[PDB]
Design a binder for this molecule. Structure first.
Ligand SMILES: O=c1ccn([C@@H]2O[C@H](COP(=O)(O)OP(=O)(O)OP(=O)(O)O)[C@@H](O)[C@H]2O)c(=O)[nH]1
Ligand SMILES: O=c1ccn([C@@H]2O[C@H](COP(=O)(O)OP(=O)(O)OP(=O)(O)O)[C@@H](O)[C@H]2O)c(=O)[nH]1
Ligand SMILES: O=c1ccn([C@@H]2O[C@H](COP(=O)(O)OP(=O)(O)OP(=O)(O)O)[C@@H](O)[C@H]2O)c(=O)[nH]1
Lengths: 131, 131, 134
């Protein structure tokens, strides 16, 4: 576990349908993630600079280029996926091999209803990636 | 206080529920404990060789037997307790009398919410036991 | 450097909070100071007669008056400070000019994490201060 990580600039891109993963699910998940990451010594220091819905793998590269071109110092994009989807491969293609943007994916079902264990799982993955 | 102690091989046995005491709580606690123990000259070196959840006093002896048989040179088992529980008495019976394995219990609340004072308390007890 | 020093009656006053300078920090620092001072022939002997936390410059004079009255033959008060603080000036006012008590200050960072070099720095300062004095 890495100490001294602070996440100051981050975004959320939700590829799950809004009707299944609503704004209140996203805001609850956001605040619960911020709380446990601060508890663990990896504080997420503010609200995401960007939190929007996207549909389809075709939206990945334009949205990520937009993020890179709009938010200086972006550290992480949290990507909500609706189950198994071709969106995953495209997010990793653009993030890992095109633009060099750290991404962390999370399943829609763990945003609709968080648990401490699944928030912990996400925190540890982020800590490894940014550490 | 005894100088010259080095804790190379150690384990965590968490008898508190994972939903209350998550993996990222355990890993963050571990790093804070490593830091203060190193500063005080009794370094708890490396990650634990073993870190697993269990439930119930009846799980103590099977788990501790596995630890003793599996990790030669094991020096300490850190045991996380869910409040007041028969787990404590069984940990002391199995550790001190049945198997001969040094153990140090810590309350779940002090893993969920670490403070320098409670980490210091833990180091001093570990120092007495291993010194 | 004076040979033949034996520091038998000494105290610790910690003006940094316990949250910063914990019990295990104090006890580790004490044992490591005891070991190096013995090896260098100026042994700081035994546990301190007094080891307590306090806060603020106003707490200095009551505590030092208590120390002077309670522990006859007190040779040294080791004073742990968080850094720059008005407590330092008060420690030296009360110790040097009011009560005539030897004090040696140490920064809390060097109690939180001792090193041989900073323990040596402290022993040399104590040796100058107490060597030859009565
Ligand atoms: O189609 C998919 C694929 C994956 N996922 C979910 O994405 C999450 C993994 O998302 P990650 O961001 O961790 O991908 P990664 O493993 O490639 O990152 P590295 O640490 O290896 O660099 C997992 O939770 C998985 O269930 C989906 O939800 N749908
Ligand atoms: O039922 C209990 C009993 C004890 N404990 C917790 O065990 C911890 C002590 O854990 P120890 O490992 O230090 O037990 P010990 O026998 O070696 O030390 P002493 O108690 O004799 O001083 C304490 O922090 C206590 O809160 C429980 O949580 N539940
Ligand atoms: O405000 C302060 C002042 C000093 N100190 C620390 O006190 C230590 C020295 O404390 P001393 O106890 O050795 O003072 P002194 O006899 O040398 O008196 P003068 O030199 O001022 O005449 C030094 O290590 C310094 O960092 C503080 O921590 N805070």
């Amino acid at each position: 576990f890495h100490t001294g990580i602070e996440i100051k600039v981050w975004a959320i891109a939700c590829f799950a349908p809004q009707r299944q993963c609503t704004e209140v699910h996203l805001k609850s998940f956001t605040e619960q993630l911020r709380k446990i990451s601060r508890d663990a010594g990896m504080p997420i220091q503010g609200q995401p600079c960007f939190c929007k819905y996207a549909q389809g793998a075709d939206s990945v590269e334009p949205m990520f280029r937009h993020l890179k071109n709009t938010y200086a110092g972006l550290q992480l994009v949290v990507v909500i996926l609706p189950g198994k989807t071709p969106v995953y491969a495209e997010v990793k293609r653009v993030g890992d091999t095109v633009l060099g943007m750290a991404t962390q994916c999370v399943q829609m079902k763990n945003v609709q209803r968080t648990t401490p264990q699944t928030l912990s799982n996400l925190c540890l993955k982020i800590n490894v990636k940014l550490g």
